[PDB]
Amino acid sequence: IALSEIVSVVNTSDGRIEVFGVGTDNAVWHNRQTAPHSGSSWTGWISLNGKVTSKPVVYINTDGRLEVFARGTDNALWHIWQTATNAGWSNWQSLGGTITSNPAVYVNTDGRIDVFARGTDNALWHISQTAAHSGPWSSWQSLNGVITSNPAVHINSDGRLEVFARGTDNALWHIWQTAPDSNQWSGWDSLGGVITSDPVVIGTADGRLEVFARGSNNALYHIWQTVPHGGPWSNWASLNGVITSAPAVVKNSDGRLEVFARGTNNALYHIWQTVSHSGPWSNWATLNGTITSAPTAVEDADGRLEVFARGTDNALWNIWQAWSAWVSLKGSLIDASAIK
Amino acid sequence: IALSEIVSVVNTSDGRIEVFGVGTDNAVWHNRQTAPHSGSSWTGWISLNGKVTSKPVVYINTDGRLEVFARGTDNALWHIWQTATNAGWSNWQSLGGTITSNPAVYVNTDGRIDVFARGTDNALWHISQTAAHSGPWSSWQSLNGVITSNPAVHINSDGRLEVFARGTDNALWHIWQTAPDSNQWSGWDSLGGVITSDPVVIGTADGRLEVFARGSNNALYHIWQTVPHGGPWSNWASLNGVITSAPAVVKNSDGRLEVFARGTNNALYHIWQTVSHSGPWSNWATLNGTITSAPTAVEDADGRLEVFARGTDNALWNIWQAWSAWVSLKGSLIDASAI
Numbered sequence: 108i109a110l111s112e113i114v115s116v117v118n119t120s121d122g123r124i125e126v127f128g129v130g131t132d133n134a135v136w137h138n139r140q141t142a143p144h145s146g147s148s149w150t151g152w153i154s155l156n157g158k159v160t161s162k163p164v165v166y167i168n169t170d171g172r173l174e175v176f177a178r179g180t181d182n183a184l185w186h187i188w189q190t191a192t193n194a195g196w197s198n199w200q201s202l203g204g205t206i207t208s209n210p211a212v213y214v215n216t217d218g219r220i221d222v223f224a225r226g227t228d229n230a231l232w233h234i235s236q237t238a239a240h241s242g243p244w245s246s247w248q249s250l251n252g253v254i255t256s257n258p259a260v261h262i263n264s265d266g267r268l269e270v271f272a273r274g275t276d277n278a279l280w281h282i283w284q285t286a287p288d289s290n291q292w293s294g295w296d297s298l299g300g301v302i303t304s305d306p307v308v309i310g311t312a313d314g315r316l317e318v319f320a321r322g323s324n325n326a327l328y329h330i331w332q333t334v335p336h337g338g339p340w341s342n343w344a345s346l347n348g349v350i351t352s353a354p355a356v357v358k359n360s361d362g363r364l365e366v367f368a369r370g371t372n373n374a375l376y377h378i379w380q381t382v383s384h385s386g387p388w389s390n391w392a393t394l395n396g397t398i399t400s401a402p403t404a405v406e407d408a409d410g411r412l413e414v415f416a417r418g419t420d421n422a423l424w425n426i427w428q429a430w431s432a433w434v435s436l437k438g439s440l441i442d443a444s445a446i447k
Numbered sequence: 448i449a450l451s452e453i454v455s456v457v458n459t460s461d462g463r464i465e466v467f468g469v470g471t472d473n474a475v476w477h478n479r480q481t482a483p484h485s486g487s488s489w490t491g492w493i494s495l496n497g498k499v500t501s502k503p504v505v506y507i508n509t510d511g512r513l514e515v516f517a518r519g520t521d522n523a524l525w526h527i528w529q530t531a532t533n534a535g536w537s538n539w540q541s542l543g544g545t546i547t548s549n550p551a552v553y554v555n556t557d558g559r560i561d562v563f564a565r566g567t568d569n570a571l572w573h574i575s576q577t578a579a580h581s582g583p584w585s586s587w588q589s590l591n592g593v594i595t596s597n598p599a600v601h602i603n604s605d606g607r608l609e610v611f612a613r614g615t616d617n618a619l620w621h622i623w624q625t626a627p628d629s630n631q632w633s634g635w636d637s638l639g640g641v642i643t644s645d646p647v648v649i650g651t652a653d654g655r656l657e658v659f660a661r662g663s664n665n666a667l668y669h670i671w672q673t674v675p676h677g678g679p680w681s682n683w684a685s686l687n688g689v690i691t692s693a694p695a696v697v698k699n700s701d702g703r704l705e706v707f708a709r710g711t712n713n714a715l716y717h718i719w720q721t722v723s724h725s726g727p728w729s730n731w732a733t734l735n736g737t738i739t740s741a742p743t744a745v746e747d748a749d750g751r752l753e754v755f756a757r758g759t760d761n762a763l764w765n766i767w768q769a770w771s772a773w774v775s776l777k778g779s780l781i782d783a784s785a786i
């Protein structure tokens with residue numbers, strides 16, 4: 108597995124970006140833009156405490172309250188939630204299980220959060236809120252499979268969750284809800300290829316899933332649904348470069364996908380669709396810096412891409428599609444990824 | 448009440464704009480882009496049948512199935528829905544009641560559609576799916592009040608629905624859910640002013656409701672939440688101009704609000720925030736054309752505002768933000784607004 112993300116990032120309900128990372132104390136810390144604009148100053152680092160052995164995953168409930176999921180020191184799944192939107196936080200609470208990956212989080216069409224994780228059998232497990240943005244939580248259930256990467260989850264344009272994972276053959280496998288909100292899932296299906304990173308999945312402007320991954324010659328590769336919310340999938344295509352991290356993918360305000368990755372010089376590179384969505388790809392460009400994690404991208408309230416990465420000082424650095432100069436948000440972050 | 452929207456518009460689950468309006472036959476017709484791009488070609492008008500006496504209101508379910516709400520000839524609320532995402536249509540079904548307004552439709556945080564309509568007692572009534580994107584429907588419930596306009600509905604940035612309406616005083620009133628997904632509503636509250644259009648409400652890029660209405664001098668006024676998801680509201684402010692339609696508001700790809708309205712010369716006028724979201728407003732500017740309806744606005748998949756309006760030929764016309772040539776989508780539409 109290629110070097111992974113160190114921070115989770117989300118757009119709050121009031122348009123401020125909020126980053127979550129693991130500290131040197133193995134607590135979860137969070138930083139928040141003071142105002143909803145590109146190159147806004149930040150609140151400074153605030154601790155949620157806890158003791159975590161994975162990447163924390165933040166997700167926004169459908170009522171605007173942030174929720175963070177992480178593997179505890181017992182290797183169970185823990186979580187913690189805002190008690191009101193953008194306000195105070197609950198105590199940490201255990202969802203049990205034993206997980207050997209980073210969680211992957213998405214919300215069902217009925218506002219119920221689903222969490223996915225590799226188990227000790229290397230099978231993919233899930234647990235869900237049994238009501239909209241609310242406990243109590245279901246029991247753990249297995250979707251079987253044998254996965255050698257962290258899972259990645261997105262929703263189909265028809266409301267069916269779809270999970271992607273590397274298998275024991277190192278091809279990309281994937282599995283889908285049979286209906287929206289359903290505990291009934293499809294068989295595992297191979298999309299072939301050779302993947303040397305966690306897959307990252309995004310929905311295109313035209314409702315098609317597109318998956319990106321590092322492949323065998325350290326080039327970036329992608330594969331996409333050829334029609335909305337179904338097969339057949341395209342063949343693998345190459346975007347070249349030589350990368351040394353997982354890719355981070357995001358949509359510009361006009362629908363054009365942009366991909367960010369660490370290069371061989373440990374600088375941040377990017378490549379974007381030109382003209383429009385489902386248009387041709389540019390050549391790679393450098394944004395410089397020196398990074399010790401995969402980048403993480405998100406779109407701010409202004410429609411500008413913002414990218415976050417750990418530096419050599421183990422602080423979090425930001426750059427925005429102004430691109431701007433690199434700036435430090437300070438702090439001291441660790442790579443607690445369950446699968447390295 | 449200022450001349451209403453003639454079409455309802457949605458960006459479908461595959462980035463294709465789809466238009467719903469009433470034809471000369473009093474059926475609901477729909478037109479859909481063939482490709483998810485600005486100035487794409489259109490499928491041509493397909494009928495969903497029915498006989499309607501309101502503007503039809505379309506909403507995307509959480510699973511991507513369009514659903515359409517319209518007053519029937521019996522003055523009941525009727526609906527028809529896609530059986531699969533961007534695929535075949537059900538038959539019309541009645542949700543009953545007796546309504547004296549255009550419906551207004553939003554989705555709760557649990558994926559249950561809520562529908563709002565004036566009743567025969569001039570009160571605000573509502574009815575809801577009892578599960579995510581599915582029947583059965585709840586029974587009609589009153590939120591009381593006395594309203595002399597079509598309600599407008601939006602969700603707060605904390606998951607609480609909020610409904611806006613002109614009262615008997617011609618002032619902007621509103622009422623809100625107490626908790627996300629709740630049947631327990633606040634009391635009615637007045638934001639004051641004097642308005643001669645239906646109110647139009649949008650969520651800003653920073654989680655604040657802003658409401659737009661035509662004032663008694665036929666100028667454009669707006670008022671806003673001063674903090675995310677609650678009071679106090681600001682004072683009314685004018686953006687001046689003279690408008691002869693309901694204004695339509697939409698958020699640009701970068702969060703800058705933009706308002707569209709018919710002028711006294713029956714042309715399309717627009718005004719926009721400059722620099723950033725919550726920047727200062729531009730000056731009014733024309734896009735020419737001659738329209739016999741209020742304009743409707745929507746962001747397409749390329750991030751460009753598209754505007755729809757009936758012309759003097761009663762065909763639906765489309766202009767988009769490059770701006771483009773006016774383009775006829777053809778057909779023959781009627782202003783069926785219940786008010």
Ligand SMILES: COC[C@H]1O[C@@H](O)[C@H](O)[C@@H](OC)[C@@H]1O
Binds near residue numbers: 159
């Ligand atoms: C996510 O934080 C969970 C941790 O909460 C801590 O407060 C507990 O001491 C510790 O158990 C010894 C858990 O792993």
Ligand SMILES: COC[C@H]1O[C@@H](O)[C@H](O)[C@@H](OC)[C@@H]1O
Binds near residue numbers: 347348369372391
């Ligand atoms: C010395 O750096 C080699 C880089 O060469 C660049 O031309 C590639 O695009 C880039 O891959 C994204 C490589 O890392």
Ligand SMILES: COC[C@H]1O[C@@H](O)[C@H](O)[C@@H](OC)[C@@H]1O
Binds near residue numbers: 498519521
């Ligand atoms: C949406 O169309 C509703 C109308 O459908 C018609 O087909 C019904 O016969 C008629 O019943 C009076 C309804 O008003």
Ligand SMILES: COC[C@H]1O[C@@H](O)[C@H](O)[C@@H](OC)[C@@H]1O
Binds near residue numbers: 639683
């Ligand atoms: C939305 O109400 C705006 C009203 O604001 C008042 O301040 C104006 O005097 C009045 O114009 C005579 C407007 O209608």
Ligand code: NA
Binds near residue numbers: 111401402416417
């Ligand atoms: Na990162």
Ligand code: NA
Binds near residue numbers: 170214218219
């Ligand atoms: Na939720």
Ligand code: NA
Binds near residue numbers: 214217284
């Ligand atoms: Na779902």
Ligand code: NA
Binds near residue numbers: 110111305353
């Ligand atoms: Na990785």
Ligand code: NA
Binds near residue numbers: 557608624626
């Ligand atoms: Na709600």
